[PDB]
Every structure is written in structure tokens, then in C-alpha cells.
From a paper:
As bacterial ribosomes represent a target for multiple distinct classes of existing antimicrobial agents, we here use single-particle cryo-electron microscopy (cryo-EM) to elucidate five different structural states of the A. baumannii ribosome, including the 70S, 50S, and 30S forms. Bacterial 70S ribosomes consist of two subunits, which are the 50S and 30S.
Extensive classification gave rise to five different classes within this single data set. The last ribosomal class depicts the disassembled 30S subunit structure.
Residue numbers in the entry:
A (entry chain g): 10 to 142
B (entry chain k): 12 to 128
Amino acid sequence: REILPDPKFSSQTIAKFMNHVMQDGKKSIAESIVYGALERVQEKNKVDPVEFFETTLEKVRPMVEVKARRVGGATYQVPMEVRPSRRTALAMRWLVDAAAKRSEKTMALRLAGELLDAAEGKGAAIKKREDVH
Amino acid sequence: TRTVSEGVAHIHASFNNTIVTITDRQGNALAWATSGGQGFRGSRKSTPFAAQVAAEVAGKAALDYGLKNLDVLVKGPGPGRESAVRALGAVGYKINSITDVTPIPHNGCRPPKKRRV
RNA sequence: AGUAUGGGAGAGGAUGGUAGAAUUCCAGGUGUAGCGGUGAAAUGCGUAGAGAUCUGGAGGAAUACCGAUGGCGAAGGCAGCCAUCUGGCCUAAUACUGACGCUGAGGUACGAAAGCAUGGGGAGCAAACAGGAUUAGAUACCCUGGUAGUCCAUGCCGUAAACGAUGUCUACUAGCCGUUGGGGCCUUUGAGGCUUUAGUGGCGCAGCUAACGCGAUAAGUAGACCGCCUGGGGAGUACGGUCGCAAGACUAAAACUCAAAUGAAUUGACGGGGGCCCGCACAAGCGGUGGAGCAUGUGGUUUAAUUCGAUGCAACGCGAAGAAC
């Protein structure tokens, strides 16, 4: 199932991230928060967010996932390879919670703050992503 | 402290537990490691993921003597037999020979009875 | 049917000598905190010094590959190497005695393992025995210690699913594909190919059998002889007799009870039975119940009744789409 890119920036990654932030179909309040966070992070550096959001998400993009397979009653945890779409889904699910973990006035401001923190490397979204795990 | 740098290695691999011992060419022990001191304390000690770490913690202790002449001797079948050399090659140990020295008896005593279940 | 001749294969048997590997034990060198085990833990060992490795000794058993769809032997049975004695079989016709052959009740010999008696030995393994687990119970399947035995020499015992569940001997009856010991023929032109025997395999014609199947190694067609059976249980049991150190071994009933006890195959079902398939069935993702408060039903107590039904999934916001009269 393919989704249409956003009419503002013509990018499907932003549309899928909005589909991950949106809750109960409230596309309006999610688009508002996303646009506010984008315009906020654009103030620290006058850079088009379509170039920077991809870099920020690939900074946190995972490589492999650890799933259990039952054979003889033990866990036997081993990493496995998945398509990049699953890794982008995991990265989006990691970013949507790290912004809520913060304490600030509105969701847009804390989302922009968490995104900037994960940009330079001070955010917890990249910390929860572990290589050995 | 000896800096002989021709120490052989004995990797005894079994279905229950594996043992790594880096000794000299004569046979005097230099650095030995077991899965017991690792901390698994169970059947997980038979996993190769524990055997590779048990071999690495012995290789790092044998590196204090400056060992680079690796002559491996493996005894007994089971899992974790290949993890020892694959772990030792990651750190950069120079390998000289790899062979099977597992001893097969020639008409020894009577073996135990086969486990039904 | 048998004898002598020249050749060939063979864990055939008896006696004696000899070796490797491996296990255990006894020290010695370095080292040493975990080692051993179950689907999980412990009983067990060890800081005296665990486990592993190397080096020297001690004794006991067997002989990894060769090994085979092998081979030898009347059967049971027989596998490290070498020396002696000895048995049986196969292959070529030369002569020879010339029916001298087969079967065989009584009798006799050999005869798996285990056990009994006598003198030793005893490494590992292990009836009985002890401890530690699971199970409602475990007395057993599991693990840790261990005595007889397993070994040698001399006797007793004659018992096994001692089965090819198929007595010995002889002659006849389509074929296809391998193996073993020989012989012959063709160009041993090459370990080649083709036929004749003596053993050992897999299909298969006809024929036989209730079926399963056999089918030139018959369970087919035929002959001679020995043994054995007359429903099941009682019962290979009582009594008696023979053998034996014993265990027991051999021979071998009756009273009574029942209308069953059997073999093969068909269709289902089962199966902790090996596959196969599918299932929002397991994997993943999202949102709830189970925590609080309220509405509703059911279950229990009470009363005058708390009208009657619905009761695992498939009853419980069900009958009831609506009890202040």
C-alpha cells in the first residue's frame, strides 16, 4: 500500500512520519505539530527540512532486529535482516516516544527539541537504539 | 614473563562444557579459561557464543607473554568447536596449523548403555 | 557311493609365544577454582589441592579401518600378529572295489547365555544394596557410589524367539539382474567377453495356498523313513519313575470350567504417528479486559415472594424491540 507525498513538500517520508504521529485519525493535529516542529528547527539553521529530516532519521535508523524462534524451549535470541521499510518504521516509532518523554509546553516544541537533540547526538532516540542489542 | 611466543593451544570441546588452555610447547600451563567463570552456570555454557568469549578471555591473558605462534589441538565433538578459532582469528592471532587431534580408542572398555529417552 | 594322484580358498578346531590403541591406578613438572550430570537441580569430588596436558610405571579385557549384499562350521558357534598338530570343502580325469545307499524307534556325542563345585585374578561394566529427582503415591524409567558375575584351568547342569517359527535324502518343472570358489573357450588382443559346477541374493512364468506369500535354496509336481496334533483354560501341571551337589532336567494325567479361544484381510476411528495442507491458528503491528467508579445479567444469603426459563466453547446487554398501574 503506497501513500501519497505531502502537498507542501512533496515527500512521502514526511507523510509516513505523519501517519506514525497521528492518533485516532486526527491528521490535522498531527500535521500542525509536524509543521510547527519543522518551522521551529528551521530557525536554528535556515535549512530546508526535506534535506535534514532524512539525515536525522538515518542517524537513528537501525540495522537488524532481534526476534525469538521456538525450537526446544529456549529463547535463542539472534539478530535478523529485514527490509529497510521495517527499519524506518522502527525509527519512527522510536522518535514518536522520545518527544513525548520530554517535558515542555506543547508537543511541537518538545518534538523539535528532541529532533534537534537526536541530530547532534544528545537525544535518547539514538540511545535506545543499541548495536549489540 | 617468558616471551617464548611458541605456545600451543588445546580446545577441548564437549556437548556439556568446553575448555581452552594455552600452554607451552612442552606442556606447562600458561593461561587456561573455562565457561564456569563466565557466569552462565547451565546448558548455555555449551553454546558457542559463550565458547568464543571463553577463548578470548584466555587469548587476552596469553597475550601478556607475547604469543603469536598458534598451534591448535581440538579434542571432542559438539557445538562450539569452530567458535574458538573464529574468535581467536578476530583479534589477529597468527595461525600456524589446524588439525583434528581427537583421540579415537581402538577397542577400549565397554561404553554405557544407550539412553532411552 | 568311495579310494590314491597333482592344485585352491576359508573368523574350522586345540596348544604356545607376542604387540598397538584405549580405560583405571601409582608418582613427577607447570597450573589450578570450579569440575561431573538431568528437559531442570542435587546426591559426588576438590584450595590437602578440582578439571585439562605432558612424561615413567602397574595390571585386566578386547582387537578401531580391513568388514562385505563376506567367509568357515552338523548345530550352538568362529575376527589383533606369529609357531606346531589336526578336521572339513572345492576343482581335472586317470584307474580302481563294484550297489558296498538313504532313513533310523532305543542308544550315544556335541550343544548359546546364566548358574552350581574346586584354585586364582579382578582394569572397565554391572543383578541385589545406598543416596539424590519427577509423580497424589515411585518401590521403576533418570543421575551419583557398588557386591556376586563378566576372566583363566578342571567337572556338573542339557536348558533358549537353540527361528528359515519350514526334518533327511533323491529326480523333474520358463525366465531377468548381482556376489563367492573353481574350470573351460574366444583375439591373456586389456582387470575383457561367453559357458559348466559347488554356495550365497533380489524379482518373476506356471503351479500351490483361506489370505499373507512360496516359486530350481518351493510352501510346485513325485518316492522312502523318523517325529509330532486332535477345542480353550486347567497344564507342560498333580502323582509316579530316571538323572543331578543344588537349581532343577526328562516322561507325563485327571477332576473341573466355557461356547469360545484363532490367522489374514476390508471400511472406519484412534495415535504423544512420520509426513502434507490450511486456518487472525502461531510471527509482527495497533487498541482493550484483568486496577478504579457507574449501568446491566448471572451465581450465593434473607425474606412474603425475591414469578419461570437459558448453564463449557454453543448460558450470563439472553427470552425481554424497553416491570411506578
